[PDB]
Design an enzyme around this catalytic site. Structure first.
Site, PDB file in Angstrom:
ATOM      1  CB  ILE A 110      -3.066 -12.845  35.125  1.00  0.00           C
ATOM      2  CG1 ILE A 110      -2.720 -14.307  34.884  1.00  0.00           C
ATOM      3  CG2 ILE A 110      -4.516 -12.583  34.689  1.00  0.00           C
ATOM      4  CD1 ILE A 110      -3.441 -15.275  35.834  1.00  0.00           C
ATOM      5  CG  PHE A 121      -6.642  -3.098  47.397  1.00  0.00           C
ATOM      6  CD1 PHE A 121      -7.928  -3.610  47.469  1.00  0.00           C
ATOM      7  CD2 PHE A 121      -6.460  -1.736  47.584  1.00  0.00           C
ATOM      8  CE1 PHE A 121      -9.017  -2.778  47.732  1.00  0.00           C
ATOM      9  CE2 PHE A 121      -7.558  -0.898  47.831  1.00  0.00           C
ATOM     10  CZ  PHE A 121      -8.827  -1.429  47.878  1.00  0.00           C
ATOM     11  N   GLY A 122      -3.549  -5.412  44.334  1.00  0.00           N
ATOM     12  CA  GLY A 122      -2.454  -6.339  44.108  1.00  0.00           C
ATOM     13  C   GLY A 122      -2.449  -6.952  42.732  1.00  0.00           C
ATOM     14  CG  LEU A 123       1.021  -8.190  39.428  1.00  0.00           C
ATOM     15  CD1 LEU A 123       0.344  -7.331  38.335  1.00  0.00           C
ATOM     16  CD2 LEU A 123       2.506  -7.885  39.428  1.00  0.00           C
ATOM     17  CG  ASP A 151     -18.069  -5.956  44.173  1.00  0.00           C
ATOM     18  OD1 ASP A 151     -18.892  -5.309  43.502  1.00  0.00           O
ATOM     19  OD2 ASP A 151     -16.841  -5.835  44.034  1.00  0.00           O
TER      20      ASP A 151
HETATM   21  C1  LIG Z   1     -10.409  -7.997  33.066  1.00  0.00           C
HETATM   22  C2  LIG Z   1      -9.271  -8.647  33.192  1.00  0.00           C
HETATM   23  C3  LIG Z   1      -9.203  -9.915  33.963  1.00  0.00           C
HETATM   24  O1  LIG Z   1      -9.394 -11.000  33.399  1.00  0.00           O
HETATM   25  N1  LIG Z   1      -8.861  -9.864  35.267  1.00  0.00           N
HETATM   26  C4  LIG Z   1      -8.306  -8.726  36.012  1.00  0.00           C
HETATM   27  C5  LIG Z   1      -6.876  -9.054  36.448  1.00  0.00           C
HETATM   28  C6  LIG Z   1      -6.843 -10.352  37.262  1.00  0.00           C
HETATM   29  C7  LIG Z   1      -7.661 -11.456  36.585  1.00  0.00           C
HETATM   30  N2  LIG Z   1      -7.893 -12.600  37.495  1.00  0.00           N
HETATM   31  N3  LIG Z   1      -8.274 -12.418  38.796  1.00  0.00           N
HETATM   32  C8  LIG Z   1      -8.475 -13.683  39.274  1.00  0.00           C
HETATM   33  C9  LIG Z   1      -8.981 -13.895  40.658  1.00  0.00           C
HETATM   34  C10 LIG Z   1     -10.019 -14.790  40.928  1.00  0.00           C
HETATM   35  C11 LIG Z   1     -10.572 -14.846  42.202  1.00  0.00           C
HETATM   36  C12 LIG Z   1     -10.157 -13.955  43.184  1.00  0.00           C
HETATM   37  C13 LIG Z   1      -9.127 -13.053  42.923  1.00  0.00           C
HETATM   38  C14 LIG Z   1      -8.528 -12.145  43.945  1.00  0.00           C
HETATM   39  O2  LIG Z   1      -7.363 -11.771  43.827  1.00  0.00           O
HETATM   40  N4  LIG Z   1      -9.262 -11.898  45.057  1.00  0.00           N
HETATM   41  C15 LIG Z   1      -8.853 -11.147  46.197  1.00  0.00           C
HETATM   42  C16 LIG Z   1      -7.720 -11.582  46.877  1.00  0.00           C
HETATM   43  C17 LIG Z   1      -7.303 -10.916  48.022  1.00  0.00           C
HETATM   44  C18 LIG Z   1      -8.008  -9.814  48.488  1.00  0.00           C
HETATM   45  C19 LIG Z   1      -9.146  -9.361  47.823  1.00  0.00           C
HETATM   46  C20 LIG Z   1      -9.925  -8.156  48.379  1.00  0.00           C
HETATM   47  C21 LIG Z   1     -11.271  -7.955  47.675  1.00  0.00           C
HETATM   48  C22 LIG Z   1     -10.214  -8.333  49.886  1.00  0.00           C
HETATM   49  C23 LIG Z   1      -9.117  -6.860  48.219  1.00  0.00           C
HETATM   50  C24 LIG Z   1      -9.560 -10.040  46.671  1.00  0.00           C
HETATM   51  C25 LIG Z   1      -8.501 -13.084  41.680  1.00  0.00           C
HETATM   52  C26 LIG Z   1      -8.178 -14.628  38.258  1.00  0.00           C
HETATM   53  C27 LIG Z   1      -8.181 -16.056  38.052  1.00  0.00           C
HETATM   54  N5  LIG Z   1      -8.454 -16.905  39.056  1.00  0.00           N
HETATM   55  N6  LIG Z   1      -7.880 -16.564  36.837  1.00  0.00           N
HETATM   56  C28 LIG Z   1      -7.584 -15.716  35.844  1.00  0.00           C
HETATM   57  N7  LIG Z   1      -7.503 -14.382  35.893  1.00  0.00           N
HETATM   58  C29 LIG Z   1      -7.813 -13.900  37.108  1.00  0.00           C
HETATM   59  C30 LIG Z   1      -9.041 -10.990  36.180  1.00  0.00           C
END
Ligand SMILES: C=CC(=O)N1CCC[C@@H](n2nc(-c3cccc(C(=O)Nc4cccc(C(C)(C)C)c4)c3)c3c(N)ncnc32)C1
Length: 265
Positions: free
Chosen positions: A16, A21-23, A129
């Protein structure tokens, strides 16, 4: 327990994008659904603090909140599994579609976020945040709030310290940039900045100001200008979110009524 997902229960289909800090990958979760899977690099988060809070977080189930489905913790790097949001981040969704949206649509996006935030506020959960970059777009253009409370687990001091180079000062109320005094009222300040990002069609707030300049500007009364697509009534609500005293800011429950009043009439 149910919140633990075995690696055999997940498949990775394609990337995606890069998260914090991660993919993040698109994949499938056995007998469930299509999911987004985050692989977190070692040392980036307090994994034990997160694992202790995972079941609690998973109970914050609301249609305008991106859901945490579980955690794959068998081996490093650990994986966090979330509800898949088909249209991605709201920041890029607006930036790539400048000129398309009517103010009624932009206001409806703010209303979706406000509804999810009123649910967290009633639950006494602070996001910490909130920004367009973590609001995600799903089916029928619904906006959902994601990553609420996740900064509690970040270990890099450049991100957590109110003076760190990667701290989100642009979305911080003065009590947050001064004292890290988080509350639902500091989330309201962030929500006002989110409204500005939405009505500006994804412009970056305080684009040509350093973080130290934003602190000084905000502390001396500077506020973001009115976006062309925001009415004077919408801009008045943004300014209420940016009142210096948290007590003078509206609660999300009050904002939800005020914004719906404009949206429904
Ligand atoms: C602009 C481009 C864009 O659209 N993006 C940027 C790249 C990733 C995309 N992304 N990220 C999530 C998503 C949704 C909720 C949480 C997280 C998460 O990992 N929390 C997360 C997980 C572990 C640790 C942390 C720390 C903050 C503690 C580091 C955070 C990731 C996601 C989803 N569900 N469905 C679709 N795309 C998604 C968003």
């Amino acid at each position: 327990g149910k919140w633990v997902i075995d690696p055999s229960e997940l498949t990775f289909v394609q990337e995606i994008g890069s998260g914090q800090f991660g993919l993040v990958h698109l994949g499938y979760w056995l007998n469930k659904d299509k999911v987004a899977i985050k692989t977190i690099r070692e040392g980036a988060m307090s994994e034990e603090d997160f694992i202790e809070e995972a079941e609690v977080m998973m109970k914050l189930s609301h249609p305008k909140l991106v859901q945490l489905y579980g955690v794959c913790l068998e081996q490093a790097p650990i994986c966090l599994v979330f509800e898949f949001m088909e249209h991605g981040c709201l920041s890029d969704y607006l930036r790539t579609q400048r000129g398309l949206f009517a103010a009624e649509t932009l206001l409806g996006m703010c209303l979706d976020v406000c509804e999810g935030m009123a649910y967290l506020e009633e639950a006494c959960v602070i996001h910490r945040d909130l920004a367009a970059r973590n609001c995600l777009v799903g089916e029928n253009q619904v906006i959902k709030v994601s990553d609420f409370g996740m900064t509690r687990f970040v270990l890099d001091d450049q991100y957590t310290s109110s003076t760190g180079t990667k701290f989100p000062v642009k979305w911080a109320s003065p009590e947050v940039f001064s004292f890290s005094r988080y509350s639902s009222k500091s989330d309201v300040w962030s929500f006002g900045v989110l409204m500005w990002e939405v009505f500006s069609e994804g412009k970056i707030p305080y684009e040509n100001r350093s973080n130290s300049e934003v602190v000084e500007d905000i502390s001396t009364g500077f506020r973001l200008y009115k976006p062309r697509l925001a009415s004077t009534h919408v801009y008045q609500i943004m300014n209420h979110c940016w009142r210096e005293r948290p007590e003078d800011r509206p609660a999300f429950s009050r904002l939800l009524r005020q914004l719906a009043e404009i949206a429904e009439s």
